[PDB]
RNA sequence: CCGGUCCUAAGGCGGGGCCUAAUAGGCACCCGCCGAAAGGGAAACGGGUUAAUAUUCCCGUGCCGCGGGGGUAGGUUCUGCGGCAACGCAGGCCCCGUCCCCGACGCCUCGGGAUAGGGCGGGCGGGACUGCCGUCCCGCUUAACCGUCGAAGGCCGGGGAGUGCCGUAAUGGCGAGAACCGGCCGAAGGCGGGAAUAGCCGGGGGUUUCCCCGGUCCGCCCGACUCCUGGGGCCCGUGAAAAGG
RNA sequence: CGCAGGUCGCAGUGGCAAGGGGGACCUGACUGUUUAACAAAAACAUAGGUCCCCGCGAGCCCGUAAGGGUGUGUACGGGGGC
């Protein structure tokens, strides 16, 4: 037809969907975990970016968390406000001291954790405003945000860091990783297309496109989408 | 290959079976309705005014 | 009715080997049942010729010659015949069992056993005769090893 | 429930050699129904019932009687022989 | 020494595991004789490897080669009859493979 | 039947009958033996080859039987005794 | 089919047998008690075989030479 | 030896007074010895078979089992025939 | 007792609800169901028979599930017995709950053990050839099921080791417990029973497929792509679930 | 697996089976994919590089709507260009 690939992605086809049946479950904090727990397993999850620890609470509730680097099987973790700020412990942001490296941070209490969930990532506890029950934290991107002090986080940094430094040496390796992730692999460049299939397709000497405005409709909003700038000058202006 | 060589692959599959309601070879086994009378997706008989 | 099919089924051989005597050509048309075919087989008008087994006299003669050592020269080899990995396995097992038996019986100090064991693993010795000759020449045992 | 009897060569050989009667019955009849029907109608004891559906769409039953009743004798009694 | 006559121990291995008994004799460095009475706790009088018994804090006063009723009067003097009848309950969910490597 | 035998889920066993023929029998593979709930290793006294379900197996004469091994049971008993 | 070695054990099954089949060889006799469930076979010396057949016929168990 | 578990079960059952189980255990011990010896002789492992037969002779002396002696005599006759054939061929 | 039938997978359908001008249109929600004749998964094999069915018919020998009867071990306030232990042994009955485990899992590589099949020398029986020699070929088989044995591997008790000691195909192992001694659990498969009474080879008699006689053996070798077992390595790839047990 | 001797032919991996080789330029790194039925390529993809929109009640996309995909996810991440 004429609808482009980014428009076809939103339909939810099998080649664009995530095979989450390959995973044991969501890696989130259950709503009402408290007390001491035991690290029983550290497992690989297909398509995820870090090893996943299985924590067995003292009252029998078991949940999945991202494993802190240095966490080991048989370890005893503490959950709750009374938990000390040691590695693997799940503490409120309000109780966590400043300068602490946490991960799996909850923006609001009870969502399960949103930020610093990739391997080798972490958030830094910058400050505490207890009079509005907020915690200022720096996310992995360098952005400083306020989060609910009653929310929960884990002390330490996410294990599995350095996974992306090693090159994906063959196309087959990225193929096998894509089959576990949700990516459609591989991707055709826009200018390698014909004009019916992409705005960049067409001419005898095919060319890319200049940036489109932020108000551009779907099917037109490809390439640079309302970019502040492009290239090395843009990076320089950013820094 | 699209002609005679591809015709040899039509020897073992099927899209339709006989419909229990209308008896035609029109019951779509995967979609689970009849393409002639509409049984399985419409309790009223499927018949359109554009068809003689 | 096909007589040969019933006869082959009865005799438990191939239809290619079932043979019908021409003297029963008149009686073939009256054959109705496997009992009738059994009656003809009992009379001997239907029989099974013996199967052919490939004769092996030529092979046995050539195998004797090959055991003596003929017909295995450079012009008769087309691919790999010797297995290097299997040869290494056999070489290690022979030398290790010999040295371990000597140490178990006490003819070799464990340190000398260690030196010989590491040399064997490191491919110092061509064969068991070489190992025995080394042991006798360097006097690593109180009595000579045969 | 019984439609008729099968008096072919195979059925006659089975009757004479194995004490079996061959009947054509309704396609919906089960082995239990066939055995009870045979016992009620003919007052014999049924040993076992084997059933099949022919390529012409009929149910045929081989009814093996107990060891006190003759299938050939029963066929002669009903006169279907 | 901990494993001594008059000591209350709990058998850890075998059929009688988790059951309490009283050490009444010493065989050698490897074996001692235990009889936490079979009518009382269920541990018949016999030798046991000291590695297969876990000593408790409790201890009673009896003489070497003491009899079953001697151990019985010692336990009732200490008030330990119900403690001897109780069977130890493990918490299997706590143990990880590091503990049994 | 035939595709079920083309799949490798059953064992292909060649056997010579008393009638002099060679036939292929398709037999089930053995079921896995019970494992310890902590270590995952096979439990002693219960690791005999079993080929079908519904066969009652006798557990070893110990508390918790074919659920945990003697090592886990003894260590847990020691911890509970101290605790 | 099951095999028994002790005559005392085998007699408990053979006494209830529907039939006892006898097979003879130069050194030993196979006695096979055919019950509803199983066929119990024991190999015995010929003299003990004769004694057991005599006892079984005394108990009025059927005996057949196979 | 090989059927020591059967010997221990026999004596344990007799001490406990289970005559039926004692008879079953005696049968199992005889089965153990005779089956293992017969398989060894059929595979022509005569040294292992002779060790098993000596153990069976000791067990039959210890437990008063005539069937064990009879089957051992049959197996020893077979062993003698095998050894005679080996000596004649060699 | 061979498959469907049962289970769930990717997924789908129906009702309720929400949406819709409306429906026979949509589905995040709740409930139920369907979804594999190659996945998971109860239990049958050998011989004979027909013109045509053959794990279905017949003979023989068994297995599974459900239910019952007798005997037995056991029980009848209370608990089964033995062993230091690994663990072994008939281990009472009925109902309910919970937990755990099996079900349940990739690819590559190399060690070990078997079996199917194949071959060699001898023996017996039968067949092929007739220019010379006397060689060549065929048969000599053993199902499911019951019992017993059990390689690797793991484990228990004793022992208490650093001039080390013990090794592999290869990596190697030891006071965080080695060498060494004894024991426990434990494959394919073997063997006995089944079962020679079958089948087969040969030699006769009768007649519509029945009866009789002889043999169906001895010693070795190779050996899988079939079956079992263990070791090692790779993954930004981790190689299903449920019924059922 | 090897050694010694003898011996025939035109021919001994004798049939069967069974690489011609080398130098230089252009071009695409490579393996892979492509116009079923005239194009197999220097075209596409590729690992690698780099830029942009995005802190998640996001960015991008699908649906009339109810709502949905990315997402059982979280910047060592999702999406979009070269
Ligand atoms: Mg995909
Ligand atoms: Mg183009
Ligand atoms: Mg434009
Ligand atoms: Mg356009
Ligand atoms: Mg253009
Ligand atoms: Mg077309
Ligand atoms: Mg289709
Ligand atoms: Mg040649
Ligand atoms: Mg090499
Ligand atoms: Mg049927
Ligand atoms: Mg299946
Ligand atoms: Mg399977
Ligand atoms: Mg279904
Ligand atoms: Mg046919
Ligand atoms: Mg021969
Ligand atoms: Mg090697
Ligand atoms: Mg050619
Ligand atoms: Mg290229
Ligand atoms: Mg190429
Ligand atoms: Mg073309
Ligand atoms: Mg072309
Ligand atoms: Mg390109
Ligand atoms: Mg580059
Ligand atoms: Mg540009
Ligand atoms: Zn229809």
From Swiss-Prot, chain A:
Residues 1-11 have a biased composition (Basic residues). Pfam families: Ribosomal_L2, Ribosomal_L2_C. Gene3D superfamilies: 2.30.30.30, Nucleic acid-binding proteins (2.40.50.140), Ribosomal protein L2, domain 3 (4.10.950.10). Keywords: Ribonucleoprotein, Ribosomal protein, RNA-binding, rRNA-binding. The keyword rRNA-binding applies. Part of the 50S ribosomal subunit. Forms a bridge to the 30S subunit in the 70S ribosome. Belongs to the universal ribosomal protein uL2 family. This is Large ribosomal subunit protein uL2. It comes from Pyrobaculum calidifontis (strain DSM 21063 / JCM 11548 / VA1). The gene is rpl2.
Curated annotation (Swiss-Prot), chain E:
One of its GO terms (biological process) is translation. Keywords: Ribonucleoprotein, Ribosomal protein. GO terms for molecular function: RNA binding; structural constituent of ribosome. InterPro entries: Rib_uL2_dom2, Ribosomal_eL14, Ribosomal_eL14_arc, Ribosomal_eL14_KOW, Translation_prot_SH3-like_sf. GO terms for cellular component: cytosolic large ribosomal subunit. It comes from the Archaea. PANTHER family: 60S RIBOSOMAL PROTEIN L14, LARGE RIBOSOMAL SUBUNIT PROTEIN EL14. Belongs to the eukaryotic ribosomal protein eL14 family. NCBIfam families: PRK04333.1. This is Large ribosomal subunit protein eL14. It comes from Pyrobaculum calidifontis (strain DSM 21063 / JCM 11548 / VA1).
Swiss-Prot record, chain F:
It comes from the Archaea. One of its GO terms (molecular function) is structural constituent of ribosome. It holds the Pfam family Ribosomal_L34e. The keyword Cytoplasm does not apply. Coiled coil: none annotated. Keywords: Ribonucleoprotein, Ribosomal protein. The keyword Repeat does not apply. One of its GO terms (biological process) is translation. GO terms for cellular component: ribonucleoprotein complex; ribosome. Belongs to the eukaryotic ribosomal protein eL34 family. This is Large ribosomal subunit protein eL34. It comes from Pyrobaculum calidifontis (strain DSM 21063 / JCM 11548 / VA1).
């Amino acid at each position: 037809g004429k609808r482009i690939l980014v428009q076809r992605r939103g339909r939810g086809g099998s080649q664009f969907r995530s095979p989450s049946w390959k995973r044991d479950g969501p890696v989130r904090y259950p709503p009402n975990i408290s007390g001491r727990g035991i690290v029983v397993e550290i497992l690989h999850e297909p398509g995820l970016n870090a090893p996943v620890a299985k924590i067995r609470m003292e009252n029998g509730v078991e949940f999945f968390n991202y494993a802190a680097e240095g966490l080991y099987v048989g370890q005893v973790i503490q959950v709750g406000p009374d938990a000390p700020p040691a590695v693997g412990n799940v503490l409120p942001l309000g109780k966590i001291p400043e300068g602490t490296m946490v991960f799996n941070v909850e923006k609001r209490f009870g969502d399960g954790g949103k930020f610093a969930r990739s391997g080798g990532t972490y958030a830094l506890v910058i400050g505490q405003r207890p009079e509005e029950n907020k915690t200022i934290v720096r996310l992995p991107s360098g952005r400083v945000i306020e989060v609910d002090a009653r929310g929960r986080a884990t002390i330490g940094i996410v294990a599995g860091g350095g996974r992306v430094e090693k090159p994906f040496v063959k196309a087959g390796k990225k193929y096998h990783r894509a089959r576990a992730k949700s990516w459609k692999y591989p991707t055709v460049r826009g200018k390698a297309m014909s004009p019916y299939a992409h705005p960049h397709g067409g001419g005898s000497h095919q060319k890319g496109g200049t940036p489109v405005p932020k108000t551009a409709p779907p099917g037109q909003k490809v390439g640079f989408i309302g970019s502040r700038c492009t290239g090395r000058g843009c990076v320089r202006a950013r820094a | 290959m699209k002609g005679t060589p591809s015709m040899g692959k039509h020897n073992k599959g099927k899209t339709h079976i006989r419909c229990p309601r209308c008896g035609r070879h029109s019951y779509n086994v995967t979609k689970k309705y009849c393409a002639s009378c509409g049984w399985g997706r419409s309790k009223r008989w499927r018949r359109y005014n554009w068809a003689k | 009715v096909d007589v040969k099919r019933l006869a082959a089924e009865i005799l438990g051989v191939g239809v290619s080997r079932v043979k019908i005597s021409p003297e029963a050509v008149g009686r073939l048309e009256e054959v109705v049942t496997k009992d009738d075919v059994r009656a003809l087989i009992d009379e001997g008008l239907i029989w099974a010729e013996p199967e052919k087994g490939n004769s092996r006299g030529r092979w046995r003669e050539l195998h004797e010659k090959k055991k003596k050592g003929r017909r295995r020269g450079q012009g008769s080899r087309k691919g790999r015949r010797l297995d290097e990995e299997e040869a290494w396995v056999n070489k290690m097992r022979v030398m290790r069992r010999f040295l371990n038996t000597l140490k178990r019986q006490g003819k070799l100090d464990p340190a000398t056993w260690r030196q010989l064991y590491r040399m064997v693993k490191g491919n110092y010795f061509r064969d068991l005769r070489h190992l025995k000759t080394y042991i006798n020449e360097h006097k690593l045992t109180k009595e000579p090893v045969k | 429930m019984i439609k008729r009897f099968v008096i072919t060569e195979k059925a006659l050989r089975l009757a004479e050699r194995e004490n079996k009667i061959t009947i054509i019955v309704e396609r919906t009849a089960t082995k239990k129904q066939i055995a009870d029907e045979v016992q009620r109608l003919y007052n014999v004891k049924v040993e076992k019932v084997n059933t099949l559906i022919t390529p012409r769409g009929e149910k045929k039953a081989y009814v093996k009687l107990a060891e006190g009743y003759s299938a050939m004798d029963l066929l002669t009694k009903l006169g279907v022989l | 020494k901990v494993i001594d006559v008059g000591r209350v121990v709990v058998k850890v291995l075998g059929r009688e595991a988790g059951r309490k008994a009283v050490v009444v004799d010493i065989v050698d460095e490897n074996y001692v004789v235990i009889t936490g009475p079979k009518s009382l706790s269920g541990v018949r009088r016999r030798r046991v490897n000291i590695n297969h018994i876990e000593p408790t804090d409790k201890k009673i006063e009896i003489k070497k080669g003491a009899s079953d009723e001697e151990v019985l009067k010692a336990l009732e003097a200490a008030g330990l009859v119900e403690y001897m009848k109780e069977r130890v309950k493990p918490k299997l969910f706590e143990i990880t493979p590091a503990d049994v490597k | 039947p035939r595709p079920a035998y083309r799949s490798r889920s059953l064992r292909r066993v060649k056997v010579k009958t008393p009638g002099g023929r060679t036939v292929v029998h398709y037999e089930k593979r053995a079921k896995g033996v019970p494992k310890c709930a902590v270590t995952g290793q096979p439990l002693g006294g219960m690791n005999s080859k079993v080929y079908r379900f519904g066969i009652s197996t006798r557990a070893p004469s110990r508390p918790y039987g074919g659920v945990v091994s003697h090592k886990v049971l003894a260590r847990a008993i020691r911890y509970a005794v101290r605790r | 089919p099951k095999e028994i070695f002790l005559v005392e054990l085998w007699k408990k099954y053979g006494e209830k047998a529907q039939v006892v089949r006898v097979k003879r060889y130069e050194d030993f006799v196979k006695l096979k008690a055919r019950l509803s469930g199983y066929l119990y076979t024991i190999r015995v010396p010929p003299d003990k075989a004769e004694q057991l057949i005599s006892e079984l016929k005394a108990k009025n168990v059927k005996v057949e030479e196979v | 030896p090989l059927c020591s578990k059967w010997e221990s079960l026999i004596t344990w059952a007799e001490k406990g007074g289970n005559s039926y189980k004692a008879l079953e255990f005696r049968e199992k011990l005889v089965e153990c010895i005779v089956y293992t010896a017969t398989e060894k002789v059929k595979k022509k492992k005569l040294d292992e078979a002779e060790e098993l037969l000596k153990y069976g002779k000791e067990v039959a002396k210890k437990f008063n089992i005539e069937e064990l002696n009879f089957h051992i005599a049959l197996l020893e006759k077979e062993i003698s025939k095998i050894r005679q054939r080996r000596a004649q061929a060699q």
